[PDB]
Each structure stands twice: as C-alpha cells, then as structure tokens.
Amino acid sequence: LHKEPATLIKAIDGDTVKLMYKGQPMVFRLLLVDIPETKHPKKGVEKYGPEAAAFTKKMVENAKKIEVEFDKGQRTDKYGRGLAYIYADGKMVNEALVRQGLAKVAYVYKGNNTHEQLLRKAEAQAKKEKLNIWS
Structure with missing residues (x-):
C-alpha cells in the first residue's frame, strides 16, 4: 500500500x-x-456523532501533512467516494477514531482489510477503557 499526498479542502463529518x-x-x-453519523440520512445526528465529527475535523485541520492510502480492494463506493486510510502527520485518522472509542470497526468491504487487525486491537483497548461509545 502506498501513501499519496493530498490537501485538505473540507471536513464533512466524522467519517468523510x-x-x-x-x-x-x-x-x-x-x-x-462505523462512526456515529452527523449527516445521517435517517436518524440524523446521533450519539457521539458531533464528537466524532469534531475529532476528525480537528485532526485534519491542524495537520501539516495529509496522506491518503488506498487499500487493495475496490477503491470507490457507489456514491463515488474514495475508500481510504487517511493520515494526518503520519497518524492514521481511522485508527485514532477507533482507539478513542469514537467509532467501531466496520465490516470488511470488497477486500479492503489490510489494517483490519490493527483497528480491531485499538477497538479492544477502547472497549476495555470504556471510552465514549463504550462508556
């Protein structure tokens, strides 16, 4: 897997x-x-959704360097969004969010599972520390 530079334009939500x-x-x-949604079509704003969005937002807004890392599966979803690992100054946003208990590890989509275990580990730790959604 290769990291590529990107530039922030705008954070839209915890997961986008x-x-x-x-x-x-x-x-x-x-x-x-799987992050509490703030721009959730149905149900709308959810528990911890605003907090997950603020976290994602802060992490990428204050980064000197944003990198994107595609996985080896399908690279876009049906809505045309890129499916990637995002890095803010070398720290993976996806992992940060799970470690902080602000998201759960989603099912593995279309062969995109390279960091699955890394994330399930983070999620166990946040579960043991009863963080935010595991409060």
Missing part, C-alpha cells in the same frame, strides 16, 4: 473528508470505521 487528490477535489470515506 473532502481532499484535493492528484489535482482534483474528491470525497473520501474512511475505510473500516
């Missing part, structure tokens, strides 16, 4: 960020996390 990637604007969906 808009980046300039290889010259064009593009929306990315964070791989392997």
Whole structure:
C-alpha cells in the first residue's frame, strides 16, 4: 500500500473528508470505521456523532501533512467516494477514531482489510477503557 499526498479542502463529518487528490477535489470515506453519523440520512445526528465529527475535523485541520492510502480492494463506493486510510502527520485518522472509542470497526468491504487487525486491537483497548461509545 502506498501513501499519496493530498490537501485538505473540507471536513464533512466524522467519517468523510473532502481532499484535493492528484489535482482534483474528491470525497473520501474512511475505510473500516462505523462512526456515529452527523449527516445521517435517517436518524440524523446521533450519539457521539458531533464528537466524532469534531475529532476528525480537528485532526485534519491542524495537520501539516495529509496522506491518503488506498487499500487493495475496490477503491470507490457507489456514491463515488474514495475508500481510504487517511493520515494526518503520519497518524492514521481511522485508527485514532477507533482507539478513542469514537467509532467501531466496520465490516470488511470488497477486500479492503489490510489494517483490519490493527483497528480491531485499538477497538479492544477502547472497549476495555470504556471510552465514549463504550462508556
């Protein structure tokens, strides 16, 4: 897996960020996390959703360097969002969110599972520390 530079354009939600990637604007969906939604079609804002969105937002807004890492499965979803691991100054946003108990590890979609175990480990730790959604 290769990390590629991107530039933040706008954070949209806990699980979705808009980046300039290889010259064009593009929306990315964070791989392997199920985050309380804030822009949830149905149910709307959820418990911890605003907190997950603020966290994601703060992490990418204060980063000097944003990198995107595609996995080896399918690279876009049906809505045209890129499916990737996002790095803020070398720290993986996907992992941060789970470790902080602000998201759960989602099912593995279309062969995109390279960091699945890394994330399930983070999620066990947050579960043991009764963090936020595991409060």
